């Protein structure tokens, strides 16, 4: 299948992935990762996060309320290496 839900395969892939981000420490890629857990424990389908545009609309709507201040465009298109490496075509 191709939908990303609250599975057990999805949680092991995201745990593998949450070990990884401790290497890249001069950026801020943690808050986007906690947000993407936020949409995923509440029952949504985050399988439209394979396109880099959709992540930009979501991070802009999330910037509307004042959250996610420190995130540029330079961090995000780095972070989209990672839903094509772990899972994603």
Partner RNA sequence: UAAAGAUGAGACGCGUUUUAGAGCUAAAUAGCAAGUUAAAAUAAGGCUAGUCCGUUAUCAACUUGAAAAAGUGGCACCGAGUCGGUGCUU
Is-contact 27 33, C-beta < 8 A? no
Q: Which residues bind another protein (CB under 8 A)?
A: 1-2, 8, 11, 14-15, 18-19, 22, 34, 37, 41-44
- Interface pick for RNA out of 4, 58, 71, 83 (rule CB under 7 A): 58
List residues binding RNA (CB under 7 A): 5-9, 12, 16, 19-20, 35, 38-39, 41-44, 46, 48, 54, 58, 61-62, 78, 81-82, 85-86, 89
């Amino acid at each position: 299948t191709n939908a990303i839900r609250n599975e057990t395969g999805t949680s092991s892939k995201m745990f593998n992935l949450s070990k990884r981000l401790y290497d890249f420490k001069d950026n801020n890629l943690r808050e986007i990762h906690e947000a993407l857990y936020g949409l995923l424990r509440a029952g949504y389908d985050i399988s439209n996060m394979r396109d880099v545009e959709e992540l930009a609309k979501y991070v802009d709507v999330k910037k509307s309320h004042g959250k996610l201040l420190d995130v540029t465009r330079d961090d995000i298109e780095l972070y989209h290496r990672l839903f094509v490496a772990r899972f994603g075509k």
